Design a protein around this nucleic acid. Structure first.
Lengths: 511, 194, 539
RNA sequence: AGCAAAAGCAGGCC
RNA sequence: GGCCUUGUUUCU
């Protein structure tokens, strides 16, 4: 009976009793209800759409062009354009990576005990006298057979990987009188300029090297024609990327994240040392055990899913730290040696970054061979568009040219304001490394920018097909775009590439 | 990864070429000692020999699917757009058709002949199906959960909605992905008995 | 050489690149209550808490989202809906009439996230009905003796009138009001005490909905903002009472309960936030119930700026009530019924326009048949106004009017193989994954598995404590292909050979004494589709 | 120190 | 200051 009382309590505005609401609800007139409200409504509550023109498509986020902003750094997790590890030769027996390190560094024992450091680009908080002693004790615990990956209890990693730098949780009734107990602020994203070197890394992780480090396990045979053309396109693609440099990058990253999570599970407190490994075969069949790097992992009791552990990543490098000094503001650069590798000079500087990861990034890094699939189905949609133009299996029109469709030139780059036409394999390498670099430095701002720019891409598509869309809020869309273009180096340079592409469609859309 | 007690823990070895295979303690949930995975390969290379009756007999429908694959013929790969109909069709070609509640009851009657119950009319029409497979299950000791799972797999239908075009028979519903996707179809003919 | 990855789009169309084209709680509460601040505000007495109500408020004067809606417009919209539905209210009422007689308490177990009434947190509906038995059957509630849902709902709608209560949590005795409100509160949870009731109204909406459906045509496409956060239960109750007005008296006694309990839904205030002593280096945690009990100046700008608007709807016992609201959707087909009713008006004022839009979920698409383009403009204007009349808001930010036109699973070996293959199988069949993508997905899955359990090929140059015995078997057997992948050997899959398990594809080429070593029925360690055997084992 | 825009982590227990 | 689940986590 209290339920009946509350049933009367949920009377809307206007009636008194729920019985009165019911006798109202079955004995009221239908007509004369809505159009009187239409005459009653405001003359301002409206939508009032608006036809879309070219001239409102302004440069997205022109605050990047102001020259009183700091340079876009390189704040990813490893090194991509400047990879260098040593030159090795083994049989093909997949050894333990301890022995891979104990082999490859012992081969180049010019850098065995180069105990003469020369500090180069030391940043605001990185200190010389914990990194150097840390790295020398670490590599003096690679070249001995006491055991496998560990370290010793020292203060050096206790500074550069961070014991004791969390607070002490204490009951809250004494957290009332102390006026210092204040809520934090959000992280202020420092706005940053356009990129002038990430263009070179899209110029350099798309070049045919002489290396290949990709294996794929075999499948069963085939007799079906769909399987014939499926494996046909698959082998053409995997032939056309296997000598890219990003394949080496990809397999470095995958082996790195795999070893990282597996040893973080298998070692929680013993500070491991992981060789950064990627075996790469040559053209003829000889293997290479390329070691470039050593890592350091601190104490790793990981309860939930946003626990983090400090991953210091040493990595031997070739090109000098003295060209774009803003690119490396978290790069401690010791100097250890130099190697006349084949011809002239290349130096040895190891770049002692400090860094950290959470388990979503590790598990999401173990998955990072997935980007092959996205690039593959992107290529699939491209060639199904092309065969929708012609009518049958027409990747044979792409690699050699069929009866009607020549291998078509694809616009990829632009020199002095004039376009260049790369080959098909060039563009497929490009699509692959785009979906990779979408992963490499990918955080939530990129998903935000992509999920909001997709509508503008659809809009400019419909503008290209003369459909003439109508948008209620251009300022809403643009505010949604440039709310988050702040400080992730793929995002800003994607916006610059957008502005140049928009300028090209503007100058080419005169008819 | 525990073990059943007794001589069962003596047909595997303890240590083989340095590798461990089992433990020597006792657990607390099922009160046993653990094993390896090198044990599960050691039994595949060097264990005692089994028998090969019933294992053929209780799984037959997927062998029928196997020979339907191996007797099939393909045709032409097509191109161009397609139009599909989101239709609920039977997915796999079922052996025999019966309601699932009385089906579970009559396979429970097959399992327990003394605890079968009363002879009903469905049991009276299905008694020849009872006997003609009760004569099949004699030569083995396959576990009743395995028997019941294969029987409920071989006797209950499967209806879900999906886009489809061309054919409607459940063999084609099983092979629709080799038939067609979204811009291509494949002429295909299944083989053997359907 | 300057290069630009967007330069694909000079040739390839962008419509083909589709694959690459506590704080939340309090902000949701503010976005609900902010939309009808100046509406009607009637204070309850069973709780006495502040409970604001957007029914029959004044009309807004802006473009922002709101919640204001009169009643009789909704009532006659559903009336005209019934005028296009001859006896479909009668049909749905009789359908629930035959459905409710067979209602048992069976439908509880499918509740992988489901709130309970004692533990104060989420359960997978496991001990839900058992807790109802051990906490109600000592209070002379008796429904499981018959097993039907109907005596259970009868004595549970009689249960809140009991002034005291006694149950084992230790034991516990409380009085009436907390016995009510502890069953009222939602942590986007639900209530198992009302889950059957909302299932009744949900299948009511199912029976309602499942049978349903020169002149320049502009068209639109868009969703609706604050869609959970702007509707209201009073409109729900008037809807279901309009439906039951030809039903017998017990149905109107019983169908008018679910919007009653959604007409007093309290809300739990999340986990909380935190503070910082940057020098003293000691912290604490202000939890869900005790937000305002603090120095209110000792927060940031943002929490203080939210609480300064929150506070006049705050229960003193730490869970603020939201008299409108829907909270991530649990009346989804019912709100869909409301939305398609909003679409079905099809004219106002009899101008030179007409609508033929189709139903959908919270998103939609219109088909406006009008005379000239300006008639389309005014018709879209009055469509937005009429949709505004029902407490609904159209998103003008995510729309475009236009001219017409996850790796390996890991429970065993064999069924792991089977489940991965059927995931890739159904993913191929549903959304049109291209065959090269799944063909490579087979390879990436085999590489995932052959890392996961170290079962590589014996003719490889991998090492390991596991792989040596596999190599030993390889140099032992004459069965040049008849192995399964957890014991070395190849993998023989492709696009076609998908719906078979392992052993019942590789039995024919298999070795006799090897398969006799495999299919031994005295296998001591053993305790989609599958096949029994040695590999079918568990922890 | 470093990571990351759900207020968190850079240990717990003893 | 000790314990946090004896290890080999060897991608053609």
């Amino acid at each position: 009976q209290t339920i009946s009382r509350l049933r009367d309590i949920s009377v809307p505005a206007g009636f008194s009793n729920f019985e009165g609401m019911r006798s109202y609800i079955d004995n009221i007139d239908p007509k004369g209800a809505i159009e009187r409200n239409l005459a009653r409504m405001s003359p301002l509550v409206s939508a009032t759409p608006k036809k879309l023109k070219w001239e409102d498509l302004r440069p997205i986020g022109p605050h990047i062009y102001n020259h009183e902003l700091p340079e876009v750094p390189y704040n990813a997790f490893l090194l991509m354009s400047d990879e260098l590890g040593l030159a090795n030769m083994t049989e093909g027996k997949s050894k333990k990576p301890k022995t891979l390190a104990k082999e490859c560094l012992e081969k180049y024992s010019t850098l065995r005990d180069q105990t003469d450091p020369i500090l180069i680009m030391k940043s605001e908080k990185a200190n010389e006298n914990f990194l150097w002693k840390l790295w020398r004790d670490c590599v003096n615990t690679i070249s001995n057979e006491e055991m496998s990956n560990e370290l010793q209890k020292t203060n050096y990693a206790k500074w550069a990987t961070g014991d004791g730098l969390t607070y002490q949780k204490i009951m809250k009734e004494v957290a009332i009188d102390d006026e210092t107990m204040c809520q934090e602020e959000p992280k202020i994203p420092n706005k940053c300029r356009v990129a002038a070197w990430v263009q070179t890394e899209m110029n350099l992780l798309s070049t045919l090297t002489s290396k290949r480090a990709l294996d794929l396990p075999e499948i069963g045979p085939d007799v079906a024609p769909v399987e014939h053309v499926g494996s046909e396109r698959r082998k053409y693609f995997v032939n056309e990327i296997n000598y890219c440099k990003a394949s080496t990058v990809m397999m470095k990253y995958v082996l790195f994240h795999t070893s990282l999570l597996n040893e973080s599970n298998a070692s929680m407190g013993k500070y491991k040392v992981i060789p950064i490994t990627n075996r790469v075969v040559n053209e003829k069949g000889e293997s290479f055990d390329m070691l470039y790097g050593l890592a350091v992992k601190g104490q790793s009791h990981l309860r939930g899913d946003t626990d983090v552990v400090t991953v210091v990543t040493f990595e031997f490098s070739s090109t000098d730290p003295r060209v774009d000094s803003g690119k490396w503001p978290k790069y401690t650069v010791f100097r250890i040696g130099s190697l006349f590798v084949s011809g002239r000079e290349k130096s040895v500087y190891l770049y002692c970054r400090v860094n950290g990861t959470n388990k979503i990034q590790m598990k999401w890094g173990m998955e990072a061979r997935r980007c092959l699939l996205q690039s593959m189905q992107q290529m699939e949609a491209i060639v199904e568009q092309e065969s929708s133009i012609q009518g049958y299996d027409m990747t044979k029109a792409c690699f050699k040219g069929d009866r009607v469709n020549s291998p078509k030139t694809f616009s990829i780059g632009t020199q002095e304001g004039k376009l260049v036409k790369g080959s098909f394999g060039k563009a497929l390498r490009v699509i692959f490394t785009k979906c990779l670099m979408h992963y490499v430095f990918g955080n939530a701002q990129l998903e935000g920018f992509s999920a909001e720019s997709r509508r503008l891409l659809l809009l400019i598509q419909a503008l290209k097909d003369r459909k003439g869309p109508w948008v209620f809020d251009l300022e809403g869309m643009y505010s949604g775009i440039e709310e988050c273009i702040s400080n992730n180096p793929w995002v800003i340079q994607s916006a610059y590439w957008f502005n140049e592409w928009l300028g090209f469609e503007k100058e080419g859309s005169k008819v | 990864l525990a073990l059943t007690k007794g001589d069962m823990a003596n047909r595997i070895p303890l240590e083989y070429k340095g590798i461990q295979l089992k433990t020597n303690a006792e657990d607390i949930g099922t009160k046993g000692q653990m094993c390896s995975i090198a044990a599960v390969t050691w039994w595949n290379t060097y264990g005692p020999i089994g028998d090969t009756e019933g294992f053929e007999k209780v799984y037959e429908s997927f062998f029928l699917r196997k020979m339907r694959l191996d007797n099939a013929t393909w045709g032409r790969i097509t191109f161009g757009p397609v139009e599909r109909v989101r239709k609920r069709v039977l997915l796999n070609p079922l052996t025999k058709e019966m309601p699932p509640d009385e089906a579970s009851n009559v396979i429970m009657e097959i399992l327990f002949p003394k605890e079968a119950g009363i002879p009903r009319e469905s049991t009276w029409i299905h008694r020849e199906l009872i006997k003609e497979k009760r004569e099949k299950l004699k030569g083995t000791m396959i576990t009743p959960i395995v028997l019941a799972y294969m029987l409920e797999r071989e006797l209950v239908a499967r209806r879900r909605f999906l886009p489809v075009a061309g054919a409607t028979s459940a063999e084609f519903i099983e092979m629709l992905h080799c038939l067609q996707g979204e811009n291509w179809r494949q002429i295909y003919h299944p083989g053997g008995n359907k | 050489m300057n290069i630009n990855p967007y330069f694909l789009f000079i040739d390839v169309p962008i419509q083909a690149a589709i694959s690459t084209t506590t704080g939340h709680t309090i902000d949701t509460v503010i976005r609900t209550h902010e939309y009808s601040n100046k509406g009607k505000q009637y204070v309850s007495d069973v709780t006495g808490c502040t409970m604001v109500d957007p029914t029959n408020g004044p009309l807004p004067e802006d473009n922002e989202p709101s919640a204001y809606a009169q009643l009789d417009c909704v009532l006659e919209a559903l009336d005209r809906m019934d005028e296009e539905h001859p006896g479909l209210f009668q049909a749905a009422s009789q359908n629930a009439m035959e459905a409710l007689m067979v209602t048992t308490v069976d439908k509880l177990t499918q509740g992988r996230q489901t709130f309970d009434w004692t533990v104060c947190r989420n359960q997978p509906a496991a001990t839900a009905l058992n807790t109802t038995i051990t906490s109600f059957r000592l209070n002379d509630l008796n429904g499981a003796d018959k097993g039907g849902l109907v005596p259970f709902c009868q004595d549970i709608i009689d249960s809140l009138d009991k002034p005291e209560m006694t149950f084992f949590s230790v034991k516990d005795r409380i009085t009436r009001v907390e016995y009510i409100k502890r069953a009222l509160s939602l942590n986007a949870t639900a209530g198992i005490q009302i889950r059957g009731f909302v299932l009744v109204v949900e299948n009511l909406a199912k029976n309602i909905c499942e049978n349903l459906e020169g002149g320049i045509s502009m068209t639109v496409t868009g969703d609706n903002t604050k869609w959970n956060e702007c509707l209201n239960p009073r409109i729900f109750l008037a809807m279901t009472e309009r439906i039951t007005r030809d039903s017998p008296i017990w149905f109107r006694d019983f169908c008018s309960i679910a919007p009653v309990l959604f007409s007093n839904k309290i809300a739990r205030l999340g986990k909380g936030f935190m503070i910082t002593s940057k020098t003293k280096r000691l912290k604490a945690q202000i939890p869900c119930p005790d937000l305002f009990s603090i120095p209110l100046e000792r927060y940031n700008e943002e929490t203080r700026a939210k609480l300064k608007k929150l506070k006049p709807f705050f229960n003193e016992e730490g869970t603020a009530s939201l008299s409108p609201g829907m909270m991530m959707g649990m009346f989804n087909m019912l709100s869909t019924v409301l939305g398609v009713a909003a679409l079905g008006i099809k004219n106002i004022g009899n101008k030179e326009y007409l609508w033929d839009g189709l139903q959908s979920s919270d998103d939609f698409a219109l088909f406006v048949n009008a005379k000239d383009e300006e008639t389309c403009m005014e018709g879209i204007n009055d469509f937005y106004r009429t949709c505004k009349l029902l407490g609904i808001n159209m998103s003008k930010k995510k729309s475009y009017c236009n001219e017409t036109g996850f790796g390996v699973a890991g429970v065993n070996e064999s069924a792991d193989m089977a489940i991965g293959m059927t995931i890739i199988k159904n993913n191929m069949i549903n959304n049109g994954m291209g065959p090269a993508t799944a063909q490579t997905a087979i390879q990436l899955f085999i590489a995932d598995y052959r890392y996961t359990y170290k079962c590589h090929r014996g003719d490889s140059k991998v090492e390991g404590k596991r792989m040596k015995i596999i190599k030993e078997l390889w140099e032992n057997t004459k069965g040049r292909d008849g192995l399964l992948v957890a014991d070395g050997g190849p993998n023989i899959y492709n696009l076609r050979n998908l719906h078979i398990p392992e052993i019942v594809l590789k039995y024919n080429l298999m070795d006799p004494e090897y398969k006799g070593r495999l299919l031994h029925p005295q296998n001591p360690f053993v305790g989609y589709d599958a096949v029994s055997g040695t590999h079918s084992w568990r922890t």
